[PDB]
Amino acid sequence: NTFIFPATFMWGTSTSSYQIEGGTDEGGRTPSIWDTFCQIPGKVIGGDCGDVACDHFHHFKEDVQLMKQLGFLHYRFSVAWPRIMPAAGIINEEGLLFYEHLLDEIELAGLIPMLTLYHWDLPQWIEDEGGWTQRETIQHFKTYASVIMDRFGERINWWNTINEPYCASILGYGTGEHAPGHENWREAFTAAHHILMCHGIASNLHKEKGLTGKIGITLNMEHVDAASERPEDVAAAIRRDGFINRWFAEPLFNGKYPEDMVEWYGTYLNGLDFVQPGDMELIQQPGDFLGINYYTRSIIRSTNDASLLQVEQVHMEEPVTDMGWEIHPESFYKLLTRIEKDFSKGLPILITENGAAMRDELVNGQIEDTGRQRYIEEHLKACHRFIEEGGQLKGYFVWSFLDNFEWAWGYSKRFGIVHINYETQERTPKQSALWFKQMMAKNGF
Numbered sequence: 405n406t407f408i409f410p411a412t413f414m415w416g417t418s419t420s421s422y423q424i425e426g427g428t429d430e431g432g433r434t435p436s437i438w439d440t441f442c443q444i445p446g447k448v449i450g451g452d453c454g455d456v457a458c459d460h461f462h463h464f465k466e467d468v469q470l471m472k473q474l475g476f477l478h479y480r481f482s483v484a485w486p487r488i489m490p491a492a493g494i495i496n497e498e499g500l501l502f503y504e505h506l507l508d509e510i511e512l513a514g515l516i517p518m519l520t521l522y523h524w525d526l527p528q529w530i531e532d533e534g535g536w537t538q539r540e541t542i543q544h545f546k547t548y549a550s551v552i553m554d555r556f557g558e559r560i561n562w563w564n565t566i567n568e569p570y571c572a573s574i575l576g577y578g579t580g581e582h583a584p585g586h587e588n589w590r591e592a593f594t595a596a597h598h599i600l601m602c603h604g605i606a607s608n609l610h611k612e613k614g615l616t617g618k619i620g621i622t623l624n625m626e627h628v629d630a631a632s633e634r635p636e637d638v639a640a641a642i643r644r645d646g647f648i649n650r651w652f653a654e655p656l657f658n659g660k661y662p663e664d665m666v667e668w669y670g671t672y673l674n675g676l677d678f679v680q681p682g683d684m685e686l687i688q689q690p691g692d693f694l695g696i697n698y699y700t701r702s703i704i705r706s707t708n709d710a711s712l713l714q715v716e717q718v719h720m721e722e723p724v725t726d727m728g729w730e731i732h733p734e735s736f737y738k739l740l741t742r743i744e745k746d747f748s749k750g751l752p753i754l755i756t757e758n759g760a761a762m763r764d765e766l767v768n769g770q771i772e773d774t775g776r777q778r779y780i781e782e783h784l785k786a787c788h789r790f791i792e793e794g795g796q797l798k799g800y801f802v803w804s805f806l807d808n809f810e811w812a813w814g815y816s817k818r819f820g821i822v823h824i825n826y827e828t829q830e831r832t833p834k835q836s837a838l839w840f841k842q843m844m845a846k847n848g849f
């Protein structure tokens with residue numbers, strides 16, 4: 405019962421600019437879609453916003469240091485587009501300088517970075533122009549991806565293009581639940597096609613510059629089980645699987661959308677009119693690795709309701725996070741397995757986000773987060789059984805170095821291995837972070 409991981413296995417943590425940085429009106433930065441969205445009554449638990457957050461804008465030196473001391477080799481962060489492109493075609497030099505310095509600190513501690521170009525903080529001025537439902541957005545993206553790549557990239561070992569196109573498009577324009585908060589399936593599907601092109605856009609800029617860094621997109625995926633053996637339930641689960649995974653995984657690897665999904669969406673796709681000649685080829689570029697974010701599985705059953713997919717998530721109460729999310733590590737094994745067979749057929753796979761939000765309690769200045777630790781460990785064994793069976797898992801970034809703006813959940817949800825005290829801003833590593841330090845040292849509990 406030992407779990408030793410490969411020699412070269414990549415151990416990191418991740419964050420995201422809007423969720424940790426704060427300094428929203430500082431340093432030339434202008435409002436993102438989330439600064440607006442967060443203000444709409446009822447959209448984010450408690451009214452919470454990304455103002456201040458963990459204030460990583462001023463604390464960046466100690467955070468990257470706390471990583472070093474926690475025995476991390478890799479750090480995955482994102483760049484806040486609004487810090488870089490605060491208005492149309494301007495290039496804010498003070499914003500580039502924050503990341504440059506952040507990168508100085510990174511290399512000073514001897515850490516290896518991964519920069520995510522897009523992690524959901526679209527500059528509002530772009531949403532004003534139409535947001536992700538306009539092709540022109542892609543040109544703006546180009547502008548933004550070009551600056552970051554000239555300014556860095558002799559320096560960046562790992563490029564991550566889009567984080568989770570599913571959330572920014574589907575939840576962003578479709579269900580309303582993420583910024584900017586639209587409820588329009590036509591837009592959602594239009595936006596998903598544009599964001600997926602930006603991965604391509606950025607993949608082209610990367611080769612035209614001849615950079616040596618690895619590059620890849622990140623999809624959030626979810627394993628999907630039918631609720632019962634009834635056929636309409638089996639059908640239901642096929643639809644959920646197409647809706648999160650195949651709609652985004654298919655174009656990237658095979659240059660097409662899932663036909664059953666295209667048939668199901670029908671009128672909302674307006675005959676794929678948003679697809680110009682050459683787009684799908686632009687999209688279909690798996691690059692150097694597949695980034696995956698995984699948290700839980702869905703148990704799906706069919707309904708005959710008014711929703712796009714006509715599906716119901718059966719709400720499992722068995723081991724769950726503070727988010728109602730079920731801990732089912734076996735399913736992380738079955739998802740990794742399926743990703744290799746379809747789509748990724750030998751390309752390196754990186755888990756760019758994996759973690760859990762449990763209720764925390766400070767006790768004698770320590771955090772006994774046995775749930776979070778239990779959850780990480782279990783999924784790491786699921787990650788282990790997949791390696792050994794010939795799985796191309798090369799890396800694993802624990803989601804969230806720090807407790808942070810947990811989107812629509814606000815600050816009510818804590819995913820950090822390092823506890824943030826929002827009254828004083830002081831960082832305090834939790835028992836799980838101490839566990840992760842011993843684990844990377846022995847390279848495998």
Ligand SMILES: OC[C@H]1O[C@@H](O[C@H]2[C@H](O)[C@@H](O)[C@H](O[C@H]3[C@H](O)[C@@H](O)[C@H](O[C@H]4[C@H](O)[C@@H](O)[C@H](O)O[C@@H]4CO)O[C@@H]3CO)O[C@@H]2CO)[C@H](O)[C@@H](O)[C@@H]1O
Nearest residue numbers: 568571579581624697702711715716717757803810811813
């Ligand atoms: O929040 C931290 C974390 O989250 C990630 O983004 C998450 C979201 O937090 C979350 O809101 C979201 O929840 C889903 C869910 O997976 C679906 O089952 C669901 O589908 C619904 C639907 O909204 C209805 O239209 C319909 O009638 O049925 C179904 C249920 O049957 O909708 C929601 C949104 O409410 O999903 C995300 C994961 O996919 C990030 O991925 C990550 O970075 C974060 O750390």
